[PDB]
Write an enzyme that holds these catalytic residues in place. Structure first.
Site, PDB file in Angstrom:
ATOM      1  CG  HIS A 121      35.224  45.025  42.009  1.00 46.32           C
ATOM      2  ND1 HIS A 121      36.433  44.370  42.173  1.00 46.32           N
ATOM      3  CD2 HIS A 121      35.484  46.352  42.080  1.00 46.32           C
ATOM      4  CE1 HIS A 121      37.381  45.280  42.321  1.00 46.32           C
ATOM      5  NE2 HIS A 121      36.836  46.484  42.267  1.00 46.32           N
ATOM      6  CG  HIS A 160      38.484  43.231  46.122  1.00 48.51           C
ATOM      7  ND1 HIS A 160      39.231  42.123  45.798  1.00 48.51           N
ATOM      8  CD2 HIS A 160      37.638  43.426  45.078  1.00 48.51           C
ATOM      9  CE1 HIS A 160      38.873  41.691  44.595  1.00 48.51           C
ATOM     10  NE2 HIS A 160      37.891  42.453  44.138  1.00 48.51           N
ATOM     11  CG  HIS A 191      40.137  33.671  45.985  1.00 47.83           C
ATOM     12  ND1 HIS A 191      41.412  33.387  46.421  1.00 47.83           N
ATOM     13  CD2 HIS A 191      39.812  32.704  45.099  1.00 47.83           C
ATOM     14  CE1 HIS A 191      41.844  32.289  45.821  1.00 47.83           C
ATOM     15  NE2 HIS A 191      40.892  31.857  45.012  1.00 47.83           N
ATOM     16  CG  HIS A 239      33.661  40.344  43.921  1.00 48.66           C
ATOM     17  ND1 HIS A 239      33.386  40.271  42.575  1.00 48.66           N
ATOM     18  CD2 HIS A 239      34.854  40.974  44.028  1.00 48.66           C
ATOM     19  CE1 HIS A 239      34.386  40.813  41.896  1.00 48.66           C
ATOM     20  NE2 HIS A 239      35.287  41.268  42.756  1.00 48.66           N
ATOM     21  CB  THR A 284      41.743  43.076  40.539  1.00 52.37           C
ATOM     22  OG1 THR A 284      40.676  42.488  41.284  1.00 52.37           O
ATOM     23  CG2 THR A 284      41.272  44.352  39.845  1.00 52.37           C
ATOM     24  CB  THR A 285      41.594  37.620  41.313  1.00 49.86           C
ATOM     25  OG1 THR A 285      40.577  37.151  40.431  1.00 49.86           O
ATOM     26  CG2 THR A 285      40.970  38.478  42.383  1.00 49.86           C
ATOM     27  CD  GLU A 308      41.033  44.469  44.029  1.00 49.63           C
ATOM     28  OE1 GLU A 308      40.270  44.389  43.053  1.00 49.63           O
ATOM     29  OE2 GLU A 308      41.853  43.568  44.353  1.00 49.63           O
TER      30      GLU A 308
HETATM   31  C1  LIG Z   1      38.941  31.652  33.495  1.00 48.07           C
HETATM   32  N1  LIG Z   1      37.819  32.032  34.382  1.00 48.07           N
HETATM   33  C2  LIG Z   1      37.451  33.463  34.231  1.00 48.07           C
HETATM   34  C3  LIG Z   1      36.155  33.514  35.088  1.00 48.07           C
HETATM   35  N2  LIG Z   1      36.583  33.683  36.491  1.00 48.07           N
HETATM   36  N3  LIG Z   1      35.426  33.950  37.153  1.00 48.07           N
HETATM   37  C4  LIG Z   1      35.387  35.155  37.747  1.00 48.07           C
HETATM   38  S1  LIG Z   1      33.902  35.521  38.529  1.00 48.07           S
HETATM   39  N4  LIG Z   1      36.403  36.043  37.758  1.00 48.07           N
HETATM   40  C5  LIG Z   1      36.569  37.342  38.145  1.00 48.07           C
HETATM   41  C6  LIG Z   1      37.785  37.681  38.771  1.00 48.07           C
HETATM   42  C7  LIG Z   1      38.011  39.009  39.174  1.00 48.07           C
HETATM   43  C8  LIG Z   1      37.045  39.997  38.948  1.00 48.07           C
HETATM   44  S2  LIG Z   1      37.363  41.645  39.447  1.00 48.07           S
HETATM   45  N5  LIG Z   1      37.986  41.635  40.923  1.00 48.07           N
HETATM   46  O1  LIG Z   1      38.372  42.134  38.474  1.00 48.07           O
HETATM   47  O2  LIG Z   1      36.047  42.299  39.467  1.00 48.07           O
HETATM   48  C9  LIG Z   1      35.832  39.634  38.323  1.00 48.07           C
HETATM   49  C10 LIG Z   1      35.589  38.309  37.910  1.00 48.07           C
HETATM   50  C11 LIG Z   1      36.954  32.260  36.725  1.00 48.07           C
HETATM   51  C12 LIG Z   1      38.125  31.818  35.818  1.00 48.07           C
HETATM   52 ZN   LIG Z   2      36.914  42.394  42.354  1.00 50.57          ZN
END
Ligand SMILES: CN1CCN(NC(=S)Nc2ccc(S(N)(=O)=O)cc2)CC1
Ligand SMILES: [Zn+2]
Length: 257
Positions: A116, A93, A61, A91, A195-196, A103
């Site tokens: 982010h 986007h 992703h 990371h 956001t994912t 985003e």
């Molecule tokens: C349930 N579990 C939650 C932990 N997730 N791991 C991560 S690193 N998720 C994550 C997704 C989007 C953002 S963003 N784009 O909002 O910064 C930041 C972190 C894996 C699944």
């Molecule tokens: Zn992000």
């Protein structure tokens, strides 16, 4: 499984993750004229001097640069936050074209990319517990525009050839994330979400006003990554951003006048 394509992208996510239509989803458009200065907001405290990077991973992703978060080594405090938030990973986007990729938007303007830096509230003990709490995470978001190169980004750019496809990782020690920050720490803040998927409503968003500049060559290298695994049909990793979601019953606060 979810992704960013026509058949599994942001318009579909709500079927597996109904919170996609929730009350505090991210990202949002930041209407700069409607955001209000909050004189009670404290300056951010970014303490990254002891940051210990470990690895870089293509997760299908985006790519994540991961840190040792088993001690308070790199932490974010202050601003809207109560307590101490530990850096776990960063990371980006980004877009297929220089005019899209962020985003968050600012007065509907899209940037070429968005960084982010993800942190979790140490009172919850581990990241997995933190994402289940309304104040579990703090994500520092930084816009990227295309112009001059960002020297502090080049080590990241350099290693991307080694993690081209989903599931590949590489050692990535001794990286200093201070080299990714702009000069000013002026920011907007609001309560939101990942956001994912799973889109959990656990994030205090802190979005810096000042973008960083990266070169056309640096962002071109992001766009050579692949969503697919090795030995699968090649799909370029581009346009891995969720569009702005409804603000609903939220106010965005500014740290600056
Ligand atoms: C349930 N579990 C939650 C932990 N997730 N791991 C991560 S690193 N998720 C994550 C997704 C989007 C953002 S963003 N784009 O909002 O910064 C930041 C972190 C894996 C699944
Ligand atoms: Zn992000």
């Amino acid at each position: 499984h979810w992704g960013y394509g026509k058949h599994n992208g942001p318009e579909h996510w709500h079927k597996d993750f109904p919170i996609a239509k929730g009350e505090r989803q991210s990202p949002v458009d930041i209407d700069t004229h409607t955001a209000k200065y909050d004189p009670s907001l404290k300056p951010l405290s970014v303490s990254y001097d002891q940051a210990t990077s470990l690895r870089i991973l293509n997760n299908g992703h985006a790519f994540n640069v991961e840190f040792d978060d088993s001690q308070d080594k790199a932490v974010l405090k202050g601003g809207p936050l109560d307590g101490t938030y530990r850096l776990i990973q960063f990371h980006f986007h980004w877009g297929s074209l220089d005019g899209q990729g962020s985003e968050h938007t600012v007065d509907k303007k899209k940037y070429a990319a968005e960084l982010h830096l993800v942190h979790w509230n140490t009172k919850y003990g581990d990241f997995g517990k933190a994402v289940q709490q309304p104040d579990g995470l703090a994500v520092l978001g930084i816009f990227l525009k295309v112009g001059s190169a960002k020297p502090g980004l080049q080590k990241v750019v350099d290693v991307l050839d080694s993690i081209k496809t989903k599931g590949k990782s590489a050692d990535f020690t001794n990286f200093d994330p201070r080299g990714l920050l702009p000069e000013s720490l002026d920011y907007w803040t609001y309560p939101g979400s990942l956001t994912t998927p799973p889109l959990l409503e656990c994030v205090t968003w802190i979005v810096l006003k000042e973008p960083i500049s990266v070169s056309s060559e640096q962002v071109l290298k992001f766009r050579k990554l692949n969503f697919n695994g090795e030995g699968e049909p090649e799909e370029l990793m581009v346009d891995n951003w969720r569009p702005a979601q409804p603000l609903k019953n939220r106010q965005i606060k500014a740290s600056f006048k």
